[PDB]
């Protein structure tokens, strides 16, 4: 009956492009509970307020968590044309969203550091001609098409990863370029929260 945030606290977290996403329905939550754990460093919402999001009822609650370095905080949100928003992670304009930047305290054993921070600097599909490139920009709430060709972690900064598309797919190539950022002393993470509205169920409401 209580929302299970446990997968977040166990194991090694995914990078921004391949972020693990949890969907909650029919359960009660104590957001306070989550951020109690972490040394939060930023916490902004759009179309909702930080106080309101933890004290309202929704059809569904969606939580994205991933490894993200604070150094790149500017790039991550909103206006910035930095690839992060272009090719890696975009939040919904239409619905109320929150973006949380936090740091894993030393007391948290359970989470595991990644080798490094990885992200896609560019994602493009090349036509059969192999001259014509059609940039693939991610939609909100959706995953870069290059997640299929890019590694759990970029092996090395400046690596190119490419795949060839079955003639069923129209041929040509799917081409991505990756970048890396050295791991911090403490793992820094990003959390993305979004909620959805439905007639039948407002079954995601705060535990009391």
């Amino acid at each position, epitope marked *: 009956v209580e929302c299970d945030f446990s*997968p977040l606290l166990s194991g090694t977290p995914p990078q921004v492009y391949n972020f693990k996403r949890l969907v909650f329905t029919n359960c009660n939550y104590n957001l306070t509970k989550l951020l109690s754990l972490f040394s939060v460093n930023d916490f902004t919402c759009s179309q909702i307020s930080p106080a309101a999001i933890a004290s309202n009822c929704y059809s569904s609650l969606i939580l994205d968590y991933f490894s993200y370095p604070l150094s790149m905080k500017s790039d991550l949100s909103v206006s910035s044309a930095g690839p992060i928003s272009q090719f890696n992670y975009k939040q919904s304009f239409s619905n109320p969203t929150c973006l949380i930047l936090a740091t894993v305290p030393h007391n948290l054993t359970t989470i595991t550091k990644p080798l490094k921070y990885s992200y896609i600097n560019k994602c493009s599909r090349f036509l059969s001609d192999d001259r014509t490139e059609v940039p693939q920009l991610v939609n909100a709430n959706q995953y870069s098409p290059c*997640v*299929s060709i890019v590694p*759990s972690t970029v092996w*090395e900064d*400046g*690596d190119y990863y490419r795949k060839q598309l*079955s003639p069923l797919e129209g041929g040509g190539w799917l081409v991505a370029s990756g970048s890396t950022v050295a791991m911090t002393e403490q793992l820094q993470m990003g959390f993305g929260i979004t909620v959805q509205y439905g007639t039948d169920t407002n079954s995601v409401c705060p535990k009391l």
Partner: antibody
Framework: EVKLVESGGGLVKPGGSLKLSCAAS????????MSWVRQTPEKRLEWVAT????????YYPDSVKGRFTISRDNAENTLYLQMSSLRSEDTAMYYC?????????WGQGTSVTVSS | DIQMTQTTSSLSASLGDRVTIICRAS??????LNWYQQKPDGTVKLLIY???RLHSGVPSRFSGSGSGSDYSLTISNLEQEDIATYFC?????????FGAGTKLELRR
């Protein structure tokens, strides 16, 4: 197509050393990561080492770490594996492989045996 | 280390059959699963990458699907030349880990 041809395999006494080579062609060598994957007598498959397109980064399983060194030469277009302190465990088929998310192509392998 | 279990070691099927093989993993692997086929002569080719993606030069009888920690490989309309041992690999973390294989024989 592309081609990967391993060489250097043979018999070596325990604690001894040996260096394998892999001749790459038909693709741009510099641009892909490279790995060594070995198959044991049981037909088990176990990763051995991987190296970045740059040659900058390396990774090894704990079991093989510190005894095996993986190097590449982009100009040469060959991938080398250098091994030391060999034990009977290490006997396997050895495959040049091309990495990424998945191993794109595999070499036909070279057979390495460690025994007295 | 993440442990990959191929539920079945060996199969029998007849030409034109559809058979399905499934790797299962120790931990959730975020979709990064590959399939490789080893022919008897010892030649390994990569059938499938990222669970559903299909390697070039590889025909579309082979299809893959799954998520979380259970993924499956499907071959259809089997052919003689499909006889081989098929491996599943996982690339979420390091070190990659592999399956023990699934041996396909066909019925004649």
């Amino acid at each position: 197509e592309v081609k990967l041809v391993e060489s250097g395999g043979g018999l070596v006494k325990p604690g001894g050393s040996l260096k394998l080579s892999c001749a790459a062609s038909g693709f741009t060598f510099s641009s892909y990561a490279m790995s060594w994957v070995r198959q044991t007598p049981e037909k088990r498959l176990e990763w051995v080492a991987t190296i970045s397109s740059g040659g900058t980064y390396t990774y090894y399983p704990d079991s093989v770490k510190g005894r095996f060194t993986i190097s590449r030469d982009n100009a040469e277009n060959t991938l080398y594996l250098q091994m030391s302190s060999l034990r009977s465990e290490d006997t396997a088929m050895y495959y040049c492989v091309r990495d990424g998310n998945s191993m794109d192509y595999w070499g036909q392998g070279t057979s390495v045996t460690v025994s007295s | 280390d993440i442990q990959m279990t191929q539920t079945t070691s060996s199969l029998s099927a007849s030409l034109g059959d559809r058979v399905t093989i499934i790797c299962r993993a120790s931990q959730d692997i975020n979709n990064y699963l590959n399939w490789y086929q080893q022919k008897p002569d010892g030649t390994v080719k990569l059938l499938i990458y990222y669970t559903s993606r299909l390697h070039s030069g590889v025909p579309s009888r082979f299809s893959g699907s799954g998520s979380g920690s259970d993924y499956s490989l499907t071959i259809s309309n089997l052919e003689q030349e499909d006889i081989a041992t098929y491996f599943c690999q996982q690339a979420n973390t390091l070190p990659p880990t592999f399956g023990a294989g699934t041996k396909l024989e066909l019925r004649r």
